[PDB]
Short mmCIF file of C-alpha atoms in Angstrom, two decimals:
data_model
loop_
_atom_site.label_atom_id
_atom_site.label_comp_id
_atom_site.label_asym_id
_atom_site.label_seq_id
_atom_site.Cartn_x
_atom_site.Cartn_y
_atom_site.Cartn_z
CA UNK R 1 108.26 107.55 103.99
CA UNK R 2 104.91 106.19 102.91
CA UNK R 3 104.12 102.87 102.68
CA UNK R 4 106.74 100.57 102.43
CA UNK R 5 108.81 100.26 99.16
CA UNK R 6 107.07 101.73 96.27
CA UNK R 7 108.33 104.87 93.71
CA UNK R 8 107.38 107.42 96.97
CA UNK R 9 103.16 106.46 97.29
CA UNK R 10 100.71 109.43 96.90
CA UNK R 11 102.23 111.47 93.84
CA UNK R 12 99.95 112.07 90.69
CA UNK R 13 97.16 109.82 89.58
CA UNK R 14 97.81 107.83 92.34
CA UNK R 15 97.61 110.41 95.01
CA UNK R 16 93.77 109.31 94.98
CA UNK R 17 91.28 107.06 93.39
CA UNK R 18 93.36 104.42 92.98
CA UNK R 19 93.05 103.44 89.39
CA UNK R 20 94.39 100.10 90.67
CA UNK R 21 96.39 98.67 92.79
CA UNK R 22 98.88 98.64 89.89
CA UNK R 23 99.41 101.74 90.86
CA UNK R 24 100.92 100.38 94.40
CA UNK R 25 103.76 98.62 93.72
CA UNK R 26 104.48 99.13 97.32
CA UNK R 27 102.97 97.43 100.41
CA UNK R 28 100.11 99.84 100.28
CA UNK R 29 97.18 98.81 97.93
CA UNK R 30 93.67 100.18 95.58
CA UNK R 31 91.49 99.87 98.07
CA UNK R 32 87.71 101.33 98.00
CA UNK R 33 89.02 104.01 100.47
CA UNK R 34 89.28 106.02 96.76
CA UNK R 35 93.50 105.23 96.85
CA UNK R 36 96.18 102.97 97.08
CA UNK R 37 95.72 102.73 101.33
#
């Protein structure tokens, strides 16, 4: 895989529109691309 550490990125509320970067505790982060990029 994904990106980088993290409980396995793009799952459930996650998977999309980001509802922070809270929600990337991995390299990736809530970006305005609508996820954690």
């Amino acid at each position: 895989x994904g990106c980088i550490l993290n409980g396995r990125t793009d799952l459930g509320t996650l998977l999309f529109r980001c509802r922070r970067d809270s929600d990337c505790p991995g390299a990736c982060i809530c970006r305005g691309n609508g996820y954690c990029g």
